[PDB]
From Swiss-Prot, chains B, C:
It comes from Turnip crinkle virus. Its cofactor is Ca(2+). The lineage of its organism: Viruses, Riboviria, Orthornavirae, Kitrinoviricota, Tolucaviricetes. This is Capsid protein. Residues 183-294 are annotated as: P domain, projecting. Keywords: Calcium, Capsid protein, Host-virus interaction, Inhibition of host innate immune response by virus, RNA-binding, Suppressor of RNA silencing, T=3 icosahedral capsid protein, Viral immunoevasion, Virion. Transmembrane segments: none annotated.
Length: 267, 294, 294, 267, 94
């Protein structure tokens, strides 16, 4: 084995001037960028880990003239519906929400079993502890604060590999059959779907034939870079910068599914 | 007290996650609190406004984690139980957050304060601070509700909480510090199944409600027990209505009407015997139902 | 921690006026901090915004009282150095005031927080409180910049500071708690004089910048060292322009153009090698200049 | 520090049915793939080393009905012209050539100074011992044999980083400005160049506009996968499987450099 | 527990007068005859094992007037596609 130590800043939160919290539950595993954009680059050479240190601080950068709460407590079982309701939240360890005008920390009893990261899929339970959570309920106005993850990991067994990703459609069917980060659904009335399952800035590159409707548009997205035609048989490219998990981008070509091909590298 | 005081802009607390503790045979088991009973919500108005919540080993609207170990017993205790206004909202907000229990856990809250401010409990404070509440608990082997009954011989009394203010916020939260005694070994429950057979009915497997009808068919769908429930049930000629309610707590119907369908609701009662009803003709035969407590 | 907290309306501190202290020959001198490195200014916005300031015995934009005793030495230490957010602005204001150093005192701040909130330093807090910051200092005989160089082999790394908020105020101020080691006895400096002779030039008296040109006359006016400087200089056919800048820190030009004039500027650099330039024809002869560090 | 042990097979040799040897001199440094394709993957986290064990064997896999010699001796000063002539070779330790129908070994007196690998450039002398050599002079016919490098290394100081990827050409110039593995040169008479600086199986994906000449052809290459047009404005893809460092692939489009864009992910 | 010792002769190989290897990957487990025709008869009375000794020899019964290579190296993870290519092979212990 090798090791590490934290320094990440896992997404924020945003007002809530409402009477029911509202959660951003973020998942924890050596490779889940939506929780590690700087360490998901050294787990492409190993498989298994540790944790020995990891805590989340509500940095505190917003005056007191604002208030409410900012729940923040982890639940091993990093996967299952957040509740819907507080008490529900306020009953699951973690413990610790405080107001937004102060500086709090959060800590987690970490174990000691040689768990494996996801070069997929699996089951969200045998591969990673559990997701994190964060709610905040208030009404007085502000852009609360930010947090990270204080940690120290153990990456046993020397491996090495990974990426995102080339995924072609075959007139009858498709083809994602070589590491993901996006799911490509379509919404009928052809207008389509071009998605994510992972989080970070990417380098798209791809797909083609009948350069129709459009292409490479985007919606719940981060920066876009398209240097293509349209193509009616062309080539294309873009750089995303996402937001929280699952942000989407899309084309526009007819009616019913066959096309060409693509490849999505993470970067 | 004297001189110096710091009413901070902000004050706040940090509560955790109560993990539970328990005893031999002697003729009983036990417990300890950790629940968080609903909140409150502003009140930027000049008259309080109450959420009165009922107390009994099985009334989820006051225990979502202990109403799962009273399906094997019947009778209890209390030895410890207090409610804290956790305090998670700055001082730039204010008013009051009344909070005092009344044995007689069932009867109209008043309408007015003084009325409230005259019934022990005592203790409201402002929303920017952390307060606690405590209750003189007795010592009689009382029974939980595998129904219905009477809201008085089966459970101490409901709790209350008001808050009157106008400066803006989502005040705080509370729970129930407790330690119970669950004698007599029993075991059973859920949401009770009771079918009507065209000639007659059928409640013949543990209660909490009595189903009377008032002629001019408009009907009756009742309780003998007290707490939050999970209804689930009954059907055939989906008539008139169904699942309406009157002296009731929250209702949840996710059915048709049905003229042959299926249905569901969650109650949150008030004091003993609150009622809900259908509407289907004239003279009694129907279908079936099952009422689990929860 | 627990219970009670007073986030006062106002909190404030009272700092004085550090008078300095010093050692034999052995092969060195020493120091101790007391500087107040620029502030910050609101940010009533949702993305921080940084003033990253560079650290080296001579970089005034980080030492206006000690960059006067490194004109006689070359190499140092650090044994003590921390930055405090003095705290002089009521709580009726809020947000954050990031503040953490990164050895590698040169490289783009990010653009984004997490990015910031992932680089040690650690420590931002709200603006209505008094915080401190500290840095694990090493132990290698590093050299100051009588120029230019490379921003990495000559100085640890720049400091940073962000603050993101919206409630209104002129937050606070900070300095640098330190104690230095200035080995090797040298002595010299100012703002370096380097003239071009129609056939050739002339840098022949201590550096910090290299003056290249890129054909298509548009030119080059550079650095090999890092800190805030006082330019002063050069002249004759006041052409194109002059004293423009690109990968630069603050610029101060109080000249003509000149077609025979005089000029001046103050830089505040970034990491090593940032550039500034004139504009005059085609092929190299001119006049003269002198670049003092400060 | 960490450590290692050999198992590599450094290129062969090929007849020589001629009267003057002929050398393949191969350079030695923890990271020089042309001498380590399986260990140049764990020096992107350190900087400095050892050697404690390292020898080259002429495996012997070719009958005696063939003959000559297979010189094979290392020279610390791993960089300088091989000679031109034998005696020259037969005067520089190493020692040990034998015939091709036998099994020989080679060994090297290894030192003991904390030397640094090349995250570049430098000087070929202060960063690595010296290159290896191998000649063989014969005329009787065969594909002699193969060798490797018996070793055990020491990788001090914990570091971590490296590589050789999206790289666009801007009509005036290009753009590789985000991690390498290939250098794109062209040979005039437009016929072009599409290269490597790294080694492994890859997932290409990319570039486009005037779909000319060709595209994605290959030459000193491993498996190719092109699922593009040509494109005259299209899109493309391929999977390489290289050989030793620097194998090349190319397009064909005119005369003088501007085009479109590309991205090369390692995989 | 009981024990054993080898002596099996696991299939051969056959020319390859070609420029890309070609593999016969054979699986290892006390009962997988395609790797044990004499010991898969005494594991019908137990369940679990060991290994303490096991090596494969290329007996050598063919003159030198013939040549090439005969790769031969095991990979714990006794199941997954052989590659397609050498280097691929020539990178996996054995």
């Amino acid at each position: 084995g090798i090791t590490r130590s934290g320094s990440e800043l896992i997404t924020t939160l945003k007002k809530n001037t409402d009477t029911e919290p509202k959660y951003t539950t973020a998942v924890l595993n050596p490779s889940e960028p939506g929780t590690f954009n700087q360490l998901i680059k050294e787990a492409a050479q190993y498989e298994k880990y540790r944790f020995t240190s990891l805590r989340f601080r509500y940095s505190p950068m917003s005056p007191s003239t604002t208030g409410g709460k900012v729940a923040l407590a982890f639940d091993r079982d990093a996967a299952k519906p957040p509740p819907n309701d507080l008490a529900s939240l306020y009953n699951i360890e973690g413990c610790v929400s405080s107001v937004p005008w102060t500086g709090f920390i959060l800590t987690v009893p970490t174990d000691s079993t040689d768990r494996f990261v996801a070069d997929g899929i699996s089951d969200p339970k045998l591969v990673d502890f559990g997701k994190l959570i964060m709610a905040t309920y208030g009404q007085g106005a502000a852009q609360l604060g930010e947090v990270r993850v204080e940690y120290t990991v153990q990456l046993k067994n020397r491996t090495g590999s990974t990426s995102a990703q080339i995924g072609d459609f075959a007139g009858v069917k498709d083809g994602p059959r070589l590491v993901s980060w996006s799911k490509t659904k379509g919404t009928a009335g052809w207008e389509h779907d071009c998605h994510f399952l992972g989080t970070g800035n990417f380098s798209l590159t791809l797909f083609y034939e009948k350069a129709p409707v459009s292409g490479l548009e985007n919606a719940d997205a981060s920066d876009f870079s398209v240097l293509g035609e349209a193509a009616a048989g062309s080539v294309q490219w873009a750089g995303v910068k996402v937001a929280e998990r699952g942000q989407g981008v899309k084309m526009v070509t007819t009616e019913e599914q066959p096309k060409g091909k693509w490849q999505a590298l993470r970067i």
